Amino acid sequence: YHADPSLVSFLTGLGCPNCIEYFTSQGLQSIYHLQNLTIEDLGALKIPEQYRMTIWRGLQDLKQGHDY
First to last CA, the chain: 27
Q: Looking at this protein, which amino acid is placed at residue 4?
A: D
b/e map of 27-65 (b: 16 or more CB within 10 Å)?
Answer: ebeebeebeebebeebeebebeeebbeebbebbeebeee
Helix (H) or strand (E) holding 21: helix 20-24
Vertex 9: Cα angle to 35 and 2 (nearest 5): 75
Helix (H, G, I), strand (E, B) or coil at 20: helix
Alpha-carbon distances of 12 from 66, 67, 68, rounded to whole Å:
19, 23, 26
CATH class belonging to 1-68: mainly alpha
21 contact partners, CB below 8 Å, separation of at least 6: none
What does the domain layout of the chain look like in residue ranges? 1-68
Vertex 17: Cα angle to 54 and 34 (nearest 5): 55
